[PDB]
Design a protein around this ligand. Structure first.
Ligand code: MG
Ligand code: MG
Ligand code: MG
Ligand code: MG
Lengths: 622, 621
């Protein structure tokens, strides 16, 4: 049996009924009622209980209860009166567990034995009424700020109605070691809150307030936190606590769906962690979906265009060395080919592509991925509740299965590969006299520009459905995020698109939304490709002289070599282990995506992010 | 009764069932089914019909149908077969109207009589099936891009199953005159789509694709477009068409609620426009909520703090001239006063204020408004489906009614009369040490994706008006709202998203909330002198700012050297009106304060000085 999956209402926006319906619709079993949400709900606490019963979700926790233990003695009775009022509220809600977070007042008492007495006294009051106290350490607690101190006090208090509540952010934000959790009896842990976050050198209170996200969307080791918990035997609720609102307008349903998806992904990654530490868990507890299929890069890119822009984009691609490999037999679809790169120009009207073109302009409407096990990829995407389309169904006009990406675009699952004959020999009339005119060989990486508010959802989408991994770089902007398939054949850097309201505020007139940021092709000889591309009319960028003067003062290489780089407008980067990067950029194709040609030498593995400022300055002069 | 209120599914994000449920829950009567939404919906068209029947909403339109009239002749039959396939779909959906938008193909023919014949033939095919064709001009149509051309072709075709569809964006983006709609027979208009937008000097196709918003959230004259429509007698569906988007966000149910709210507000403004043009409408058609109460500025500001931060904030306000007017009788709440400015520092734990402090830090958790008619404000806010709280109910710990702001902060509706004579223990001896006389304006820093919702919130519930400023630089247009008589003024800024603080290496990210609070005075030079001696951290402005003012404006005196010596910032309108204002440093990395002097009727905010303020604040770090 799976654990009771819950989520705190503070993790969503909207009215309390809207949150509860979204939580149930996403497949959660339980919900933490955040007290402030009750305060704004016009109905009664018992009406909340009725809503949860009607929706089939349990109220697994009421929270929070602040600053109890160690407050001044002449207010102790007043704090107990407040506890009794919360007890009254919980019995109308139909829940039996309340979270008590450690005291934050500056004048709070810190004597260990006094805290033991206060916590046991609260446990006695809760136990008398048939309720339970879960004690949580805030990372900024005045006297108690770690789970170790919580267990120390809970153990000494020794009351069955008083237990430990664990919060992954409060422990991992202080770089706490979760290993000692295994020494806590499983039945003394009452509740587990999972919360991920980026690692920031920030005040932990503000860090917790604004940057909590779902497991897998940050850079904390979630599985390494849950693994010691499950080793204790604990099988209680597994929950999520993010602090959103009241700013501003967070999609309730998609946030709830992402939350459940993140718990499914957390369970699998936690299960794998236990298997690798030779302490596996009994089957049937942790989500165990099909492993992701292996990948062999991109099968083809599908662009949504009309006949005018599609011909213009096709011209760009022959100047970049692509051959016209042939036209679709019945549709207005052109195939272009170079090396292992296949690009499909879809100009067929009244179709999935045509809608995408009208909705976004010239854009990438689909990507076919080379997968070794097509059915494994499809079943895993379905297990993580992506939307599949069997072939020739809905927007999927291919015969292989497709997975819907968070926007409208599709991901085709193409299994190699026949030989007589492929996917192209069947639907296209291939000109067996094409041959490309350049030496671009494969798609090395492809960057997306995404809205800031949707990027974490895309990150979780690729991490869970396709088992991608983080691939970030620290270099103004220091950090640029990217994802990567396990074996590196697929690489997906992710940039932040400009909002519409800033395009209005700065009175622009050139605003294109989100979509492909750029597509990068590799080659053997950067100079041979630049020469052919520049002469064929590709609008490659002009790099100022001061850039190459700077390379002279820093790298110290052959003088005859650097003057060639300056003449060929080639940009340069070098790692610490002698690997080198040679890459050039084109201007944006009609104010959207641009192209990149790279040469990787002696194991260079980065993206040349050090040259982004130089690229932006070059594109600026237009 | 009311017209049939609809919204196109393309205006929302989510699955088709989620969209339809949100549309029904928001109170719409109908929905336009965008065909692409059907393509991604795993169920059948009749299941869509069943969902809408279960939810109590009608399918008022199917759309779109592209590039029919004037295409080359060997695709006419193929285009009719495509129309017949759509006819099959609409009958399974249970709708009888399809939108046909004007041709955009480059090789489309524009011969007038041939277009009439094509549209007449399509109308005959629709008429045979008992269905209707609604012809819409796209602003970028190859041959037909105006409603005038549409009506000309529809009139000549002269078929009862072929009518006109009007789209406010397609007309107003071309600056078209909507009055000639009054001459169109009401029964020949089949559908009306309302869409607002900012006026931007850009390609209309991309302008329509990315910047459509709900009526009142943009800059177009929505009521001036609907008024001629209703003059024809048209009482058909009134709908919304904005284009969202693909790339996530957009809360489906809040967007649907905002959409309905925008139609209600549009109906009231259109009613008033027709009443002002001596062409009133029969009662019961257009939304008629209580008119907004008149305002008399801010009664008090309520800040959410703890005792440590609250004392430091009290010190800031004391140095700015505020007197400690007294403490609450039972709670940890301090009252501070200067002129007609009341500031409440709420440090009471285990309360609405305490929850707000833990969620946001030091922040403004509520604003009390001076309203002449308290019940009129409350009934209007409820009529536009805001969330009211009676006193001592929920988060409202005052005894006057409160309206919930989108972020959870409260707006108290205070009728003039004693408010602090009941819960505070007033120090009769207070007396301020300023100076400052009233709150002139309050800027909010809001998320980019939530600002349009806030604009509609204040425009509709409280009848605020647009009050924007256009400067010349980066920043060009600064958004602001304003009460009808100007006693309440609300500039709106865009706060930084958290993922940009992540993308850099930031360590102080503080999010949304109050941007700054501005107090006015008589004598800017006196206040600056008084404030500097009391310790207010006023900004020092570099000389190059005043060298620039020398080249921009001509000065009497002596005078510009005096502005520089007191670090006063300056602006001048075209009517001799002048602004004198200074800024403090931010209070603990959030809001800052502003002292202003308005002289010859200056009405702006001094937006020309934003770059100078930001540069000065950055140097101070
Ligand atoms: Mg917690
Ligand atoms: Mg790149
Ligand atoms: Mg339209
Ligand atoms: Mg101001």
């Amino acid at each position: 049996a799976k654990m009771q999956r819950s989520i705190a209402t503070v993790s969503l926006s909207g009215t309390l009924p809207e949150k509860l319906e979204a939580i149930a619709a996403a497949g959660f079993d339980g919900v933490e009622i955040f007290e402030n949400d009750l305060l704004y709900y016009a109905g009664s606490p018992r009406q909340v209980r009725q809503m949860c019963a009607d929706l089939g979700i349990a109220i697994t926790l009421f929270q929070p209860f602040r600053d109890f233990e160690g407050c001044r003695r002449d207010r102790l009775q007043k704090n107990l009166d407040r506890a009794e009022r919360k007890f009254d509220l919980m019995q109308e809600l139909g829940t039996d567990l309340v979270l008590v977070c450690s005291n934050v007042q500056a004048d709070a008492l810190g004597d260990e034995q006094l805290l033991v007495d206060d916590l046991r006294l609260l446990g006695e009051h809760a136990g008398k009424r048939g309720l339970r106290i879960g004690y949580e350490a805030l990372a900024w607690g005045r006297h108690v700020n770690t789970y170790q101190q919580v267990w120390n006090l809970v153990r000494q208090a020794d009351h069955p109605a008083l237990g430990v509540i664990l919060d992954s952010f409060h422990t991992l934000s202080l770089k706490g070691d979760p290993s000692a959790i295994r020494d806590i009896p499983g039945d003394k842990i009452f509740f587990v809150q999972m919360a991920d976050a980026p690692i920031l050198a920030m005040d932990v209170l503000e860090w917790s307030r604004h940057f909590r996200c779902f497991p897998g969307q940050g850079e904390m080791d979630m599985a390494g936190f849950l693994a010691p918990i499950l080793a204790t035997g604990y099988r209680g609720p597994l929950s999520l606590e993010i602090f959103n609102d009241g700013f501003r307008a967070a999609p309730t349903r998609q946030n709830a769906a992402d939350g459940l998806r993140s718990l499914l992904y957390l369970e699998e990654q936690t299960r794998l962690r236990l298997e690798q530490e030779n302490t596996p868990i009994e089957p049937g507890v942790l989500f165990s979906p099909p492993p992701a299929s292996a990948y062999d890069g991109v099968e083809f890119l599908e662009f949504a265009v009309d006949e005018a822009v599609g011909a213009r984009l096709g011209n760009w691609l022959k100047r970049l060395g692509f051959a016209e490999a042939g036209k679709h037999r019945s549709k207005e679809v052109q195939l272009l080919r170079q090396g292992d790169i296949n690009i499909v120009l879809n100009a067929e009207p009244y179709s999935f592509g045509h809608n995408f073109f009208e909705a976004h302009g010239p854009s990438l409407c689909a990507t076919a991925l080379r997968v070794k096990d097509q059915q494994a990829a499809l079943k895993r995407a379905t297990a993580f509740r992506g939307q599949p389309f069997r072939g020739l169904v809905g927007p999927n006009e291919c015969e292989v299965p497709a997975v819907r990406a968070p926007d409208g675009s599709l991901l085709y699952l193409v299994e190699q590969g026949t030989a007589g004959h492929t996917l192209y020999d069947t639907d296209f009339s291939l000109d067996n006299n094409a041959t490309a005119t350049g030496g671009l060989r494969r798609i090395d990486h492809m960057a997306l520009a995404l809205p800031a508010e949707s990027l974490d959802s895309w990150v979780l989408f690729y991490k869970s459905l396709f088992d991608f991994a983080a691939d970030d770089e620290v270099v103004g902007l220091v950090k640029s995020r990217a994802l990567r398939s396990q074996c590196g054949t697929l690489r997906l850097p992710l940039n932040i698109s400009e909002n519409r309201n800033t395009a209005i505020a700065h009175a622009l007139s050139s605003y294109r939304g989100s979509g492909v940021h750029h597509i990068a092709f590799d080659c053997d000889d950067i100079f041979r490709e630049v020469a052919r591309a520049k002469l064929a009319g590709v609008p490659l960028l002009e790099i100022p002289l001061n850039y190459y003067d700077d390379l002279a003062a820093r790298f110290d290489f052959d003088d005859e070599f650097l003057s060639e780089l300056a003449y060929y407008n080639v940009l340069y980067d070098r790692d610490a282990q002698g690997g080198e990067l040679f890459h050039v950029y084109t201007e944006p194709f009609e104010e959207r995506f641009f192209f990149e040609i790279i040469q990787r030498k002696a194991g260079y593995a980065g993206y040349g992010a050090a040259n982004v400022a130089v690229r932006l300055a070059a594109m600026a002069k237009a």
